[PDB]
Design a binder for this molecule. Structure first.
Ligand SMILES: CCCCCCCCCCCCCCCCCC(=O)OC[C@H](COP(=O)([O-])OCC(O)COP(=O)([O-])OC[C@@H](COC(=O)CCCCCCCCCCCCCCCCC)OC(=O)CCCCCCCCCCCCCCCCC)OC(=O)CCCCCCCCCCCCCCCCC
Lengths: 110, 37
């Protein structure tokens, strides 16, 4: 893993509306195949940088588990930021519709 | 003459309510015959 700060900055630029107009202008004379190939090439460049530079270079976060810990941290951040938020919303929804635990209730007895 | 100074119908003789209906998975007040599996 690497360039997390650059990724945050990319997300910021993406949400900035002015960049929406800039991208609208850049998309003049452009194809979906070209856009897809460019994105795929960017991702491949990132992963190739990793594969090459891990052989001789060590980041500030280097540890006896290597990039496994950084990847687990990315996963855990994604989890706590998105999935647990969705769980909170679903919990409030279920509590308003059926009551807390309503989705695990037993079938009506016959 | 004061016997007719105040007869629509009558008060109900009996009443039925929702809490009188039985409920329960084990309560035998709801079991007549076993339901097939
Ligand atoms: C709160 C933590 C808990 C989070 C939620 C729980 C989640 C649990 C799951 C954890 C999963 C972790 C994700 C792992 C994936 C990899 C991430 C990674 O390695 O890169 C991260 C990334 C590093 O990017 P990079 O690609 O490695 O490039 C480095 C640069 O070249 C720069 O090069 P450099 O050499 O100059 O420095 C390298 C590096 C150096 O990093 C270090 O080595 C750490 C330095 C201090 C050592 C001790 C660390 C712990 C105690 C002090 C820090 C407390 C904050 C906790 C930081 C946890 C990460 C170590 O820089 C940093 O990462 C700075 C991080 C410290 C920012 C402090 C901001 C303070 C605001 C919060 C108030 C104070 C804390 C409140 C109490 C929180 C208690 C939980 O760090 C950033 O966050 C970038 C910030 C960009 C600016 C954003 C604007 C400022 C906002 C500040 C907050 C930024 C977000 C951090 C949130 C935490 C603070 C609230």
């Amino acid at each position: 893993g690497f360039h997390f700060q650059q990724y945050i900055a990319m997300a910021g630029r993406a949400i900035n509306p002015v960049q929406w107009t800039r991208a609208w202008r850049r998309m003049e004379g452009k194809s979906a195949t070209e856009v897809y190939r460019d994105a795929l090439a960017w991702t491949n460049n990132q992963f190739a940088q990793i594969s090459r530079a891990s052989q001789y270079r060590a980041w500030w976060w280097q540890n006896p588990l290597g990039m496994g810990l950084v990847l687990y941290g990315t996963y855990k951040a994604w989890h706590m930021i998105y999935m647990v938020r969705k769980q909170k919303k679903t919990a409030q929804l279920v509590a308003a519709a059926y009551g807390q635990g309503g989705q695990w209730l037993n079938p009506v007895p016959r | 003459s004061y016997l007719n100074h105040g007869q629509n119908g009558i008060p109900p003789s009996v009443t039925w309510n929702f809490n009188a209906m039985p409920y329960g998975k084990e309560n035998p007040d709801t079991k007549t015959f076993p339901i097939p599996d």
